[PDB]
Amino acid sequence: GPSFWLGNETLKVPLALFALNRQRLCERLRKNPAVQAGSIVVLQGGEETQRYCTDTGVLFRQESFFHWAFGVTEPGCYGVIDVDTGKSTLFVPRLPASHATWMGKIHSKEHFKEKYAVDDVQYVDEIASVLTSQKPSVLLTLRGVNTDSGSVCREASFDGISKFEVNNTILHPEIVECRVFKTDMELEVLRYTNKIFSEAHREVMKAVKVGMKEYELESLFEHYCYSRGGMRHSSYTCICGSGENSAVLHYGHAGAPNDRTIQNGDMCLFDMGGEYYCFASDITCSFPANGKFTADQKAVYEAVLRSSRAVMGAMKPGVWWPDMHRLADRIHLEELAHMGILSGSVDAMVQAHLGAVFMPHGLGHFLGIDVHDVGGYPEGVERIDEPGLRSLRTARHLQPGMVLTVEPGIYFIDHLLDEALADPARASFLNREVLQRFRGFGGVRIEEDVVVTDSGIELLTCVPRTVEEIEACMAGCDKAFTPF
Template sequence: MASSSHGPPEIAMELHALNRAKLVHSFRQYLKASSLPLFGFILLQGGGEQSRYCSDHVPLFRQESYFAYLFGVREPGFYGAIDVSIGKSVLFAPRLTEDYAIWSGKIKPLSSFKERYMVSLVCYSDEITEVLKSHYRGPGKPLLYLLHGLNTDSNKFSTPAKFEGIEAFQTDMTSLHPILSEIRVLKSELEISLIKYANDISSAAHIEVMQKSKVGMKEYQLEMIFLHHIYMHGGCRHCSYTCICATGENSAFIHYGHAAAPNDRTLEDGDIALMDMGAEYHFYASDVACSFPVNGKFTDDQRLVYNAVLKAHNAVLSTMKPGVNWIDMHKLAEKNILESLVAGGILVGEVDSMMEERLGAVFMPHGIGHFLGLDAHDPGGYPKGTERPTEPGLKALRTTRELKECMVITVQPGCYFNDVLLMPAMENPNTSKFFNQEAIERFRKFGGVRIESVVHVTSNGCENLTDLPRETWEIEAVMAGASWPLDSETIQKYKSTSSSSSSVAPEAPATEVST
């Protein structure tokens, strides 16, 4: 995939041809194992433009992810079919009226779609019935394999294709979804290169946000800096998810930034900022979170909580490799955070006992990470037959699978001080004994810290695709105007200053713990 210093990388459309070939291979294996005939068509319906309620305003279209995975089509209104018997693919384009050329641009010939999207044939969508019936190679009524199944992250079902004349076909709505979801779990080199690019541009945008953050600004101004950077410098018109720009107490809320909490607080001196924002490039996502002091200097309390999360983040990265279980990674992150909170005098007691009582979920209620690809929360976390844990914290995991080479997954430990979770735990006789309530009171309005990186699982470890300052002294240097990566002189200056600063708050006397 070629890239240029003058713009974003070119798109290698063979990526989608390879994805289709991978699906055909897996699907034919499934049919053979099930003693089913190797005939029929895999048929998907792409996304369609939707106006805003009853108005004629149409928000910017983004293709449905399964369709994007197989065909890479950026336009709305398409269908795509793959012949299971021979692997050839057909695109069906909407038949546009002459008015389209007046309002929206030239009407492209079908041949242009055939060349761009590297398919065998392109027809109009009102020809689906005729074309598929004429190309069917099996006996009896032509068979369509349609996409229908549960997304275990959203708890919503994918929508199977519909078109006029579908009653002339047999339809199977159970076979395709689990196979297609599973092949999306392992990423090709071309996919990883797109994900890396999206993360590179997101990392650079986060650094600009750090450097331009000032007391008195609004949270949405930080969001604007990020959005401007990824589009201006990266050609990324879409984000992977709604931007989270949380400062002060808002940083305790995991998915702050939605319409009812619209990134509109004024930044105050002494705030911690939690920025969770990711660019999307050619459908492929990034998901990056960083935390930093709004004024550019960590307080002792901010350093304590931040380093607790960083320790967890680094412990998981150093342990990840094929065969490692994701539940174990979550528990490893929890244990590191609890150990740091004990060292800082916020908690007291045995960490193993805290783990048994699931105290880590009070401070990190979300899972340690999730698959990432065409969606920030990519499918495949819970294959059919896999049960979700029910314990606090663990039930929020988006997968419990063992890691495999070529998986791309996020590592996102966090530590939050949220009364909705803290108060019941401090009143529960099984967990109240672990709290230094005087110290906890100091953190009631602290908010939270999250550090998130996108990680590629390799044959013997992992590769971090996110490139950001993570140590507190690195963040302070960058916020003071240093370029990233830091040069040797800057490293010496800020690292030596940091080593003389305490990374944890003083421990509370063991005999004076309120329960």
């Protein structure tokens, strides 16, 4: 069958991937006792948007559920699935003649049918007539709450939809659950995005020089990924945090746009990712700007390497993700105590939530079509109201087919350190004279992407990770990729 491809060495993604997702969704819905025979899933694709009141176009990226089901890159579409038969119908815009001048060839419905390997293609202006002729019992539309943004998913609507029976509660939990478990075809794409991003991280480690701006490395990474990987869209704003900026967890946004000069002695924390055909990946590398770890840098870094690998080594089906987060906390505290930053009983430190002072974010998150992927907190799975754990993006137990980031870190964040020092329950653990040396250190984060298997995990990411590996990578002469 057909495949999405951007030529050269980019990955061919079969449109069969989306057909399988549609099948899986129907299979799940058929088992839901509330689902009536004759139901039709109705999804609405994204539309082109512009900047404020201007005619400046925003680069179009498909809505994630719609992509998951159909893989359609064009704006202005709808897609429906007959639950009982699995039959798919794509609705495409009927375009004006002037499109051929400004935008490109006006493709036939048959072109789209072949391109997307759906059962039928119709024009958007006929959606009410077409669905009427199919005599559905109920239209199943998408409405629910994303548990990372708190936003409500936008339900499909079209002129005439008021004449149908519409249910907007059943679909969301079911399609979310399908997205949580990746098919082998989806995993192939995530292996590819990890390959390209792993290569680009290596090129950045090779190219970094003291005196560069953070954004120079962001730019190089993005250029490698687009020109060599076909990765055009960003799945999130890149974090290139040097020096004290590596303690700022989502550094790099408009308010803090990666314009610090990298200095001799800095630690760099490079959290850079993106997507291919709307499949995301998310990798973080930490390394000394000047290519040589100091003793302090080695100690902090190897603490996070230790928790990274202890978590990966423990992950397998049935493991509770919050237990992995607490495992990382305990290891960080042990290592910070060995360094002399902390003293006392690590058991007592854990009871006082001291780990969250050094790792205030969740250990890691589901990954898929969104970087913070859906389904972390389905009905019955509660957020834990404790420091650190409350920021976890899932409190689920692991099952085969889940894709997770594993991203422990240790940071020196002044307002958290200052809170802890003011609190007698935590202050006693902290050795102020040693900690003072680490003020302004920033932090270290090591982020791997993994898939849960029947027996453990498959690591998707492949970057240098030990101190010796990183130092060797940075000292390499072959860049093999020199734009100007």
